[PDB]
Amino acid sequence: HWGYGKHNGPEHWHKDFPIAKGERQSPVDIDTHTAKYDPSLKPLSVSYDQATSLRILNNGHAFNVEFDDSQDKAVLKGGPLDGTYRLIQFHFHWGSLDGQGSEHTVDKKKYAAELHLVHWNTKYGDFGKAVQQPDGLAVLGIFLKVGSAKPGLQKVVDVLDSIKTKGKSADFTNFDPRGLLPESLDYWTYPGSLTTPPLLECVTWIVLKEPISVSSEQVLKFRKLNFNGEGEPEELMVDNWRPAQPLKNRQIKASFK
Ligand code: NI
């Protein structure tokens, strides 16, 4: 009923999910000249030392690397956030070509891909309750450009053959998400939404300024995945990004000058 095709893509989602035309939809274009430095912002705290990855799943629209979120093992705090947000999963959005694939844009520039580390606010007890709140989620977004390989991505790339098609999963223990982060934690932040149905307006977005580099070969492996299930006609999992939405009555803040 939804996907990224002509007949079921972003331009159709509002029929089932009218919140698609809402007041705080994501992604957005980040106009770097209009974002404003906010001295109120507290420092960003990424505490991933005790992370427990569990599994990788092809869900038909991306692949998710899932974590144990039943304790404070991998948490995000600080920045614009009040309280503690637990890592539940990360995934990527990517293109068919190196010139598109990101959801956020920077001065209209599209990156080859975008990494989303998804966290939920522990005050709400579980993910499902968190997505019903305006401050339920915090998503750390990281752009990917093609150039040098990212060593810490390789273990992800190499399991993708085992989850080619929708509904396939594989064990994926002992993966360290710190190996996917750039050097700087400088960021932009704004209030937004999920970028997939049901498009809930529950996300504090924290988008890092510094991209990571991945190799051609690494992105090419993303592009070998399938949206379809096994035994269905093959449709490459590419261009699984929603385009930028209207900013409306929001101001993007920067953590840096
Ligand atoms: Ni995402």
- The radius of gyration computed from the alpha-carbon positions, rounded to a whole number of angstroms, is 17 Å
Query: What is the general shape?
Result: globular
Distance from first to last alpha carbon: 43 Å
Strands, count: 15
Largest sheet: 13 strands, mixed
Strand content: 25-35%
Summing up helix and strand content along with how strands pair, one would put the structural category as mainly beta
> What is the number of helices?
3
**How many domain modules?**
1
The arrangement of helices and strands along the chain is EEEEEEEEEHEHEEEEHE
Query: What small molecules does this complex bind?
Result: nickel (II) ion
Proportion of helical residues: under 10%
Summary of the model, kept short:
The protein has 257 residues and is mainly β. Helix content is 7%, strand content 29%. The longest helix is centred in the C-terminal third of the chain and has 7 residues, at 216-222.
What does this structure look like?
The protein is mainly beta and 257 residues long. It has one domain. 7% of the residues lie in helices and 29% in strands. It contains 3 helices and 15 strands. The chain has helices at residues 127-130, 154-159, 216-222; strands spanning 29-30, 36-37, 44-47, 53-58, 63-67, 75-78, 85-94, 105-106, 113-121, 137-146, 169-171, 187-192, 203-208, 212-214, 253-254. Strands 2, 3, 4, 5, 6, 7, 9, 10, 11, 12, 13, 14 and 15 form a 13-stranded mixed beta sheet that branches. β4 (53-58) and β5 (63-67) form a beta hairpin. The protein starts with 28 loop residues before the first strand and ends with a strand. Nickel (II) ion (NI) is lined by residues 91, 93, 116, 195. Residues 1-256 form the Alpha-carbonic anhydrase domain. Belongs to the alpha-carbonic anhydrase family. The record marks 89 as: Involved in the binding of some activators, including histamine and L-histidine. It catalyses: hydrogencarbonate + H(+) = CO2 + H2O; urea = cyanamide + H2O. Zn(2+) binds at residues 91, 93, 116.
